[PDB]
Design a protein around this ligand. Structure first.
Ligand code: CLA
Ligand code: CLA
Ligand code: CLA
Ligand code: CLA
Ligand code: CLA
Ligand code: CLA
Ligand code: CLA
Ligand code: CLA
Ligand SMILES: CCCCCCCCCCCCCCCC(=O)OC[C@H](COP(=O)(O)OC[C@@H](O)CO)OC(=O)CCCCCCCCCCCCCCC
Ligand SMILES: CC1=C(/C=C/C(C)=C/C=C/C(C)=C/C=C/C=C(C)/C=C/C=C(C)/C=C/C2=C(C)CCCC2(C)C)C(C)(C)CCC1
Ligand code: SF4
Lengths: 227, 40, 742, 86
């Protein structure tokens, strides 16, 4: 996967150029396994679902990448009490790695609210993919006015999801989508970096960066194989 | 549902339910009246 | 250059119960409904014969793919039940503390009609049926120490079973792969070599290195199971692992710096058996699966899929062309990518042969702790996996003949290896015929010679070790070569792979786990019985395949089909000429040959290996009577069948009384089968006519006209009952015997 | 120091040799299969990978010869330690 920008990436192949025509955001021709070929597609391996899933992964990853390091950066700057300067994997998500006592409820009590809240958010989002525009019809406390969608599942738009109606022009919107995808793809790799770095070193993402800057040669992946 | 209830009416399904019922009745009788040899 | 890609069709079929209410929908003949009772049998006989329902290869492939998901889902329910019953209805936790004195048990019966006597006294304050499946030994090796761990696996097994059934429905009714997808044999081998076998071996090595090895190291040291660290504590705390294995203190740097010798403490090459448990070292087993993982991952990069590099299987076949074989392997690639039966014939042949190899290697190199000293488990596992291999091989002959009748096309096969084999089939069968006659005389005739000489009071004239001798010199040479292998030919191995080659016995809990096996005159004679009965089974099955299409008797046998009873009483009589009947006859001989194999194993082990260790020495269960007694047929009747059947016939009134009942019941089913084998449906159709008359007289005659079974179904019903009765008879006799004394 | 040791030099040399051999037409590549006579002939690639290299050296050739180089290097390193040379 060619880093940076370019017309085509390293893995671009003549076979993938058949259907990759630049219509999708961040379409750099990289599809060595040819999972986006329209011909004889079905199930979840089809262009509409795979492109939709990438954006959803991009947006969750962007929140995760910024949220898995902010407590360490803010804690390092003294803007939050040291009691909350906690590594992302020691928040309580993985109790064996570490858990934080001091939340207003037991982490399982909080999880049930997460289940119910995400059931509504995710199943309503799904129903717009299966039946476009269907969430703007049945009464939902008057909120159905903002759930009418825009025909494209990954980009609902509307009064809320496009609060400040940025990208009014077609050219402007394409650039914003490209910027969203590149930041999202970068964050997805960052999250994978957090997970791999946590296992290899056992420290937070911020600690690894600080140590690397201290002695870059003596602190890197190669030296962390043994300690 | 009409077709599904038709499937349950097929010979193998009826026999399984019928013998499952018949066997259960005999097993339960011998559970509450163990070792019957003479009417008495 | 057709690209390798995913290809499916959307919603090929509709999910409805409509066809569940219309039996026979799959076939044009049976769709009209029943008029005679023959229709009912035809419904079940042809249900899974996809190749005859439709002529479309794509439709056939899609049914096979989803029918395989159903088989996988069923195994997960079965596996889940075995793990669940271990958690809830077993004495596994007690067994871990005292493995050498407590009998494994995982089945409990309800107290009804007085059957609670089958809940025997197995130990650990528990009553239940003793099991011989070896699940306790497997669970210990993997590191399972609580019933909670067994319970979680069972729940995971049910989730997998649900996933398997969803996949079958999904890939038939929702997204069915197209025919071009199924024909990527190069891609399938790459994934199944490096992905299924390769990553599967690597993943299991990860479990053994991180879970099995630490847990079993402490269990052998005598630590109480409840006080052992949990597997996740071992994973998270490198400090704990360093104590057991100091190599973990260095992390994974040795792996990437190629200092692989650092891992010598848990990646060993000891060989032999662990003295404390009598099973293979788990450190040896971990290095085995790590080595196997690399070999298969390399194997999975051999075939060309989408990026030029690799091999084309078609090109390999067409390049291997010699002077003696005409065209050669040309045309095999098209055969093996368009005929499911041809693929099934090969896979059943080797899968069955593999199951037999498993039986020999597992007893000789017991891979689990406390497997060897549990004689019931050793006998059961060897016998189970020999029978599985036997049936699979006979199936290989069955589906080789189906290919020959249905999928064989002469135009694609001209002067190639397949064609040339058909053109000298008389030469092959005539020679194999003579070899079987030669082997029958010079192996079974020796037993008749010994029986007659012994009855005449001429023991000096018998073939035996105290008389005319027949020493397996070739086998004895190999036993000695493998015994001395660690000295010169395998220098880095500390011990021989097995204790059967030679050396000293290993005893666990006062019982022999394995000791050298000596081969004498009796072993020479019995082995050549095996060669005789195996060669005859090949003759019957190979004859059916080579003559499936035509013979000097029926020149147009292919048009008659694969499964027909005869071509009439003409030409002197043509009963049982079809290739299906060669499987029917081959099943009897496979049963005959494997019965001697499992009798040979049972008597040899009890006589020469199994026993109790004491101060003076080893006393075996049957006291070493194999050498002197197994050279006559009378010896087998008296010393093996008559003497060892004492346990089963005295089982009434005890927890083993169930085996006594099944011993009689099996004898019954076997004899019942001879009714179908010795008779013909002509008698039975006339008998039903008189029976139908009585029902007609009482206005109680059925609308579906009763019919005697067909000719073929009489033979199928006969052999199925013959096999069940015969095999179940040995099954009861073995378990009641070995459990009672072993 | 691992860098510069015998183990490091052998692995770098073995990996470099395969890449050099494949790039300069001394080993089979994606665009050149080998006939039964161990001679390089043109091949057909289903997923023609675009490469700006003048010789058509694709990224697949790197993975193919990176693994081939590692296999050769690992065997030599462990083999020498077996005979006592390393
Ligand atoms: C014999 C097994 C088998 C095979 C050969 C196939 C083959 C196929 N499936 Mg099917 N499938 C299977 C089992 C199988 N499936 C099972 C068991 C399920 C139920 C869970 C499904 C559910 C399913 C769905 C829902 C879909 C397919 C689709 C497909 C197609 C594309 C698959 C692909 O590219 O995957 C590549 C794999 C991925 C993209 C996912 C990788 C990660 C998965 C989720 C987990 C893998 C776990 C791994 C094996 C072990 C990890 C170990 C450890 C780290 C935990 C193809 C025809 C798709 C289709 O129809 O396309 C046209 C499709 O939509 N399958
Ligand atoms: C996917 C996104 C995500 C998730 C799941 C988490 C999850 C977590 N974060 Mg992280 N975080 C994220 C993104 C995320 N974060 C991002 C993007 C940032 C950068 C801005 C941060 C910055 C951050 C910090 C600085 C801290 C956390 C902490 C936490 C933990 C405690 C959460 C908590 O107490 O919330 C509290 C709950 C809420 C804020 C939601 C309130 C819901 C009520 C009902 C709303 C009511 C509204 C009211 C009626 C009207 C509006 C009022 C308003 C105008 C004043 C938890 C593990 C804390 C931690 O690790 O503690 C140990 C912590 O200190 N996060
Ligand atoms: C290969 C699959 C398999 C087999 C052959 C058995 C067989 C048996 N099970 Mg088991 N079981 C299995 C899988 C299996 N189980 C699985 C997957 C689960 C998890 C849900 C269970 C959960 C389970 C329970 C909870 C119980 C059994 C019990 C039984 C026994 C009585 C069954 C009966 O008559 O029910 C009644 C028949 C009908 C409803 C018809 C019997 C020995 C019972 C037992 O052993 O009691 C002492 C019992 O209580 N099984
Ligand atoms: C509820 C879901 C559902 C429904 C309504 C249908 C409906 C249909 N399927 Mg589909 N199918 C499903 C689930 C379903 N399927 C699943 C889960 C799979 C994966 C295995 C498949 C795989 C599949 C195939 C491969 C085929 C169909 C076909 C069909 C058609 C006829 C099926 C029939 O006659 O079944 C009646 C049959 C049964 C009730 C037998 C059930 C067998 C299961 C596996 C249980 C086995 C138990 C086992 C023997 C236990 C041991 C026995 C021992 C103790 C005695 C029909 C359109 C056929 C079709 O479209 O033909 C044109 C066809 O070829 N289905
Ligand atoms: C498949 C088999 C397998 C697996 C899974 C493991 C796994 C492990 N081994 Mg083992 N090992 C194996 C085979 C295996 N081993 C073999 C064959 C050998 C013999 C050569 C060894 C020899 C060995 C040694 C000598 C050691 C280990 C160690 C380890 C542990 C740490 C490894 C490490 O540093 O990773 C480094 C980093 C990674 C593996 C990458 C992790 C990537 C994560 C999962 C990505 C997650 C991304 C995701 C998006 C983030 C979550 C987000 C979400 C929460 C929102 C780990 C549990 C070490 C240990 O701690 O032992 C106790 C150790 O010292 N192993
Ligand atoms: C991977 C294994 C495998 C697979 C997938 C198949 C698949 C097939 N075989 Mg093959 N076969 C196999 C192994 C296999 N076979 C083996 C091992 C043998 C040797 C015994 C054979 C011998 C064989 C013959 C002789 C024939 C087939 C046929 C067939 C086809 C139709 C089968 C059918 O409709 O059965 C329907 C299923 C039944 C009627 C149920 C049979 C029930 C048995 C007899 C019960 C036995 C006892 C039971 C297991 C335990 C006790 C039960 C208790 C209630 C008392 C089908 C393509 C037939 C065909 O026409 O192929 C073209 C055919 O003629 N096979
Ligand atoms: C105990 C029962 C029995 C016996 C003895 C035989 C014997 C034989 N069967 Mg048969 N068979 C049997 C049961 C038996 N079968 C059953 C139950 C079935 C139904 C499933 C079959 C189905 C069957 C098939 C389908 C085939 C055979 C074959 C054979 C032959 C094997 C090779 C051979 O010539 O060996 C040598 C002969 C013997 C061991 C017989 C006994 C010889 C004695 C001990 C020595 C000779 C006596 C001596 C000359 C003194 C005579 C004195 C007298 C003249 C006064 C052989 C004639 C195969 C065949 O024909 O291969 C060529 C073959 O294809 N059998
Ligand atoms: C500088 C080059 C070099 C040198 C000096 C060595 C030296 C050595 N290698 Mg190494 N090796 C090299 C390159 C080298 N290797 C390369 C490039 C590869 C990759 C292909 C390998 C792959 C390799 C393997 C896979 C193994 C060795 C082994 C060995 C050692 C024992 C070899 C022996 O005596 O086998 C004598 C062996 C026999 C006579 C047995 C032959 C019978 C076979 C095994 C039966 C099965 C055949 C078939 C599958 C059926 C020895 C120290 C072995 C080892 O680790 O020993 C401790 C070992 O297992 N090497
Ligand atoms: C041994 C014979 C090897 C024979 C051998 O290797 O031959 C080699 C020879 C191979 O010739 P080609 O070089 O032309 O073959 C090219 C191959 O790639 C196949 O196309 O095979 C034949 O001629 C086939 C017929 C052999 C007929 C053999 C008759 C004798 C059979 C004896 C069986 C004994 C079994 C003992 C089991 C332990
Ligand atoms: C000239 C040039 C250049 C350069 C380049 C380079 C410098 C490259 C490199 C490259 C490389 C440097 C690569 C590498 C690769 C590698 C790989 C791909 C590896 C693999 C491995 C493996 C696969 C392994 C395996 C194994 C294991 C793990 C265990 C043991 C056994 C074995 C060994 C098998 C550039 C482009 C800038 C520009 C233009 C010109
Ligand atoms: S009807 Fe029976 S006896 Fe007559 S030829 Fe056919 S199989 Fe033989």
């Amino acid at each position: 996967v060619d880093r940076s920008k370019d017309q085509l990436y390293v893995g671009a192949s003549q076979s993938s150029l058949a259907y990759l025509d630049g219509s999708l955001p961040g379409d750099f021709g990289f599809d060595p396994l040819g999972l986006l070929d329209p011909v004889n597609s079905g199930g979840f391996i089809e262009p509409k679902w795979l492109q939709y899933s990438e954006v959803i992964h991009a947006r969750w990853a962007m929140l995760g990448a910024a949220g898995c390091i902010a407590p360490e950066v803010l804690g390092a700057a003294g803007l939050i009490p040291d009691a909350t300067n906690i590594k992302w994997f020691e928040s309580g998500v993985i109790p064996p790695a570490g858990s934080y006592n001091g939340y207003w409820a037991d982490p399982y009590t909080i999880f049930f609210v997460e289940i119910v809240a995400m059931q509504f958010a995710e199943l309503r989002r799904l129903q717009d993919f299966r039946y476009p525009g269907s969430m703007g019809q049945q009464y939902f406390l008057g909120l159905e006015a903002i759930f009418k969608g825009s025909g494209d599942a990954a980009y609902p738009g509307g009064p809320f999801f496009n609060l400040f109606n940025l990208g009014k022009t077609e050219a402007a919107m394409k650039e914003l989508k490209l910027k969203e995808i590149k930041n999202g793809r970068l964050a997805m790799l960052a999250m994978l970096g957090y997970g791999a770095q946590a296992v290899m070193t056992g420290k937070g993402p911020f600690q690894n960066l600080v140590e690397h800057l201290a002695d870059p040669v003596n602190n890197n992946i190669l030296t962390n194989f043994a300690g | 549902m009409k077709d599904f209830t038709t499937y349950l009416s097929t010979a193998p399904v009826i026999a399984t339910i019928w013998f499952t019922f018949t066997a259960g009745l005999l097993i339960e009788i011998n559970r509450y009246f163990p070792d019957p040899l003479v009417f008495s | 250059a057709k690209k390798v890609k995913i290809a499916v069709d959307r919603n090929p079929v509709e999910t409805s119960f409509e066809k569940w209410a219309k039996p026979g929908h799959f076939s044009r003949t049976l769709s009209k409904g029943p008029n005679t009772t023959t229709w009912i049998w035809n419904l079940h006989a042809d249900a899974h014969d996809f190749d005859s329902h439709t002529s479309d290869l794509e439709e056939i492939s899609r049914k096979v793919f989803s029918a395989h998901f159903g088989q996988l889902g069923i195994i997960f329910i079965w596996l889940s039940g075995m793990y669940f019953h271990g958690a809830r209805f077993s004495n596994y936790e007690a067994w871990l503390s005292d493995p050498t004195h407590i009998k494994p048990s995982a089945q409990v019966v309800w107290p009804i009609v007085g059957q609670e006597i089958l809940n025997g006294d197995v130990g650990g304050g528990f009553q239940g049926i003793q099991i011989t499946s070896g699940f306790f030994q497997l669970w210990r090796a993997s590191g399972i120490t609580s019933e909670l761990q067994l319970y979680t696996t069972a729940i995971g097994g049910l989730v997998m079973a649900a996933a398997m059934f969803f996949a079958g429905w999904f890939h038939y009714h929702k997204a069915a792969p197209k025919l071009e997808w199924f024909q990527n044999v190069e891609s399938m081998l790459n994934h199944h070599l490096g992905g299924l076998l390769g990553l599967g071996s690597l993943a299991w090595a990860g479990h053994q290195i991180h879970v099995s090895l630490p847990v079993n190291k402490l269990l052998d040291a005598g630590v109480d199971p409840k006080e052992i660290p949990l597997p996740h504590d071992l994973l998270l705390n490198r400090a704990i692992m360093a104590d057991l294995y100091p190599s973990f203190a260095k992390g994974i740097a040795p792996f990437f710096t190629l200092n692989w010798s650092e891992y010598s403490d848990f990646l060993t090459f000891k060989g032999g058996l662990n003295p404390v448990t009598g099973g293979l070292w788990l450190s040896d087993t971990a290095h085995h699966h790590v080595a196997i993982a690399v070999l298969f991952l390399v194997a999975g990069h051999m075939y060309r899929t989408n990026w030029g590099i690799g091999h084309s299987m078609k090109e390999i076949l067409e390049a291997h062309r010699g002077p003696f074989t005409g065209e050669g392997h040309v045309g095999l690639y098209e055969i093996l990518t368009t005929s499911w039966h041809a693929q099934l014939a090969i896979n059943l042949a080797l899968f069955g042969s593999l199951s037999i190899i498993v039986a020999h290697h597992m007893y000789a190199m017991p891979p689990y702790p406390y497997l060897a000293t549990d004689y019931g488990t050793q006998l059961s596992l060897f016998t189970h996996h020999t029978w599985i291999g036997g049936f699979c091989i006979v199936g290989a002959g069955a589906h080789a003949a189906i290919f020959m009748v249905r999928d064989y096309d002469p135009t694609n096969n001209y002067n190639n290896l397949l064609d040339r084999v058909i053109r000298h089939r008389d030469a092959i069968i005539s020679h194999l015929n003579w070899v079987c006659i030669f082997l029958g005389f010079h192996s079974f005739g020796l037993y008749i010679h010994n029986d007659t000489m012994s009855a005449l009071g001429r023991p000096q004239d018998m073939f035996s070790d105290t008389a005319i001798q027949l020493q397996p010199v070739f086998a004895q040479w190999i036993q000695n070569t493998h015994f001395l292998a660690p000295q010169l030919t395998a220098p880095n191995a500390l011990a021989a792979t097995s204790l059967t080659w030679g050396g000293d016995l290993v005893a666990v809990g006062g019982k022999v786990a394995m000791m050298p096996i000596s081969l004498g005159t009796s072993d020479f004679m019995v082995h050549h019985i095996h060669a005789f009965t195996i060669h005859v089974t090949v003759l019957i099955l190979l004859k059916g395949v080579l003559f499936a299409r035509s013979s000097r008797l029926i020149p147009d046998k292919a048009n008659l089909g694969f499964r027909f009873p005869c071509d009439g009483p003409g030409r002197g009589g043509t009963c049982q000429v079809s290739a299906w009947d060669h499987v029917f006859l081959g099943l009897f001989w496979m049963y005959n040959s494997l019965s001697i194999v499992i009798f040979h194993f049972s008597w040899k082990m009890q006589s020469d290996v199994w026993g109790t260790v004491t101060a003076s020495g080893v006393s075996h269960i049957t006291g070493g009577n194999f050498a002197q007694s197994a050279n006559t047929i009378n010896g087998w009747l008296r010393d093996f069948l008559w003497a060892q059947s004492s346990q089963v016939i005295q089982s009434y009134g005890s927890a083993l009384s169930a085996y006594g009942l099944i011993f009689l019941g099996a004898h019954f089913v076997w004899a019942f089968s001879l009714m179908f084998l010795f008779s013909g449906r002509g008698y039975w159709q006339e008998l039903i006519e008189s029976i139908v008359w009585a029902h007609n007289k009482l206005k109680v005659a059925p609308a579906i006209q009763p019919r005697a079974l067909s000719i073929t179904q009489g033979r199928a019903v006969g052999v199925a009952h013959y096999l069940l009765g015969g095999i179940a008879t040995t099954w009861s006799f073995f378990l009641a015997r070995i459990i009672s004394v072993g | 120091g691992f860098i510069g040791s015998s183990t490091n030099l052998i692995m770098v040399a073995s990996t470099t040799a395969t890449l050099a051999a494949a790039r300069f037409g001394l080993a089979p590549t994606v665009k050149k299969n080998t006939t039964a006579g161990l001679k390089l002939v043109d091949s057909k690639n289903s997923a023609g990978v675009i490469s700006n290299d003048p010789a058509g050296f694709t990224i697949v050739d790197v993975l193919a010869m990176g693994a081939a180089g590692h296999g050769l290097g690992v065997g030599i390193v462990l083999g020498l330690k077996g005979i006592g040379a390393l």
